[PDB]
């Protein structure tokens, strides 16, 4: 999918126009550039071993692959290699970079694709084949796992509602921190773009149940996390 990057396109249009004139006989120009353009488009034809390949990457994986490629391409052109050497070098590199990209896409699916273990992530994906950008909802369980927090008598109580995937999600609004009373009732304690809640130098009253919601425009919460806080009469 790496031809979806405007930079890759120009670097190709620079190889043809700036590099080929002084480093390959003109008989090979149209033919080899025909082959190069086709090779790079073929970055989207992937097999992937197992699991199967979906035809989507996130924008990071896409950038990642364009970088590998264009740094490699560039090494060649700083080298000033000509003729046959140049063609071999050029075509080894394309071959390696495809295989490399393949490993990006594989890693992307195993680890970056709908990476959330709970909640609902809005992931911006891109379709290899048409360079088209979509937003896809990864909907998982609402159970992020219960956070049991032990905090010493008079130290800070930090409640972190941040998940690693939150920074990669679309449509987030605010984190709202609730206090749950035992009444099966609650009070809004905090709300903003802060992912944490700190009641410093806490005390025995401050123990109990807390709750974090992460909102999304404009619908159901992206994340719910529950904390149970127990304060310890201790050092």
Residues that bind ligand NAG (CB under 6 A): 181-183, 185
> Count of residues for the chain?
235
In the complex, the smallest distance separating the C-beta of residue 178 from ligand NAG, rounded to whole angstroms, is: 13
What is the Cα–Cα distance from 58 to 168, expressed in whole angstroms? 10
Least distance (Å) between residue 160 CB and ligand NAG: 25
Query: Smaller CB distance to ligand NAG: residue 182 or 192?
Result: 182
Closest residue to ligand NAG using C-beta atoms: 183
In whole angstroms, give the CA distance from residue 15 to residue 215: 47
> Minimum distance from CB of 184 to ligand NAG (Å)?
9
Residue 170 Cβ, how far from ligand NAG at the closest point, in Å? 37
Query: Quick one: 170 or 206, whose CB is closer to ligand NAG?
Result: 206
Measured from the CB atom, the residue of 49 and 183 that comes closer to ligand NAG is: 183
Cα distance between residue 148 and residue 168, in whole Å: 26
Comparing CB distances to ligand NAG, the nearer of 142 and 181 is 181
CA angle 154, 157, 160 (to 5 degrees): 165
The CA distance from 107 to 51, in Å, is 11
How far is residue 169's CA from residue 165's CA, in Å, rounded to a whole number?
7
């Amino acid at each position: 999918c790496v031809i979806c990057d405007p930079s890759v396109v120009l670097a190709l249009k620079s190889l043809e126009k700036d590099y080929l004139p002084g480093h390959l006989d003109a008989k090979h120009h149209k033919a080899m550039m025909e082959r190069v353009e086709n090779a790079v488009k073929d970055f989207q034809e992937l097999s992937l071993n197992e699991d199967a390949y979906m035809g989507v990457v996130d924008e990071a994986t896409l950038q990642k692959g364009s970088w590998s490629l264009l740094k490699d391409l560039k090494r060649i052109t700083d080298s000033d290699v000509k003729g046959d050497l140049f063609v071999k070098e050029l075509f080894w590199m394309l071959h390696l970079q495809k295989e490399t990209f393949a490993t990006y896409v594989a890693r992307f699916q195993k680890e970056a694709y709908c990476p959330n273990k709970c909640g609902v992530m809005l992931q911006t994906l891109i379709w290899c084949k048409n360079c088209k950008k979509e937003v896809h909802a990864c909907r998982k369980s609402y159970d992020c796992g219960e956070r049991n927090v032990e905090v010493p008598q008079m130290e800070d109580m930090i409640l972190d509602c941040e998940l690693n995937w939150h920074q990669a999600s679309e449509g987030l609004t605010d984190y709202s921190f609730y206090r749950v009373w035992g009444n099966n009732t609650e009070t809004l304690v905090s709300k903003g773009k802060e992912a944490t809640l700190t009641k410093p130098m806490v005390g025995p009253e401050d123990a109990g149940s807390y709750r974090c919601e992460l909102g999304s425009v404009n619908s159901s919460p992206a994340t719910i996390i529950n904390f149970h806080v127990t304060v310890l009469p201790k050092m």
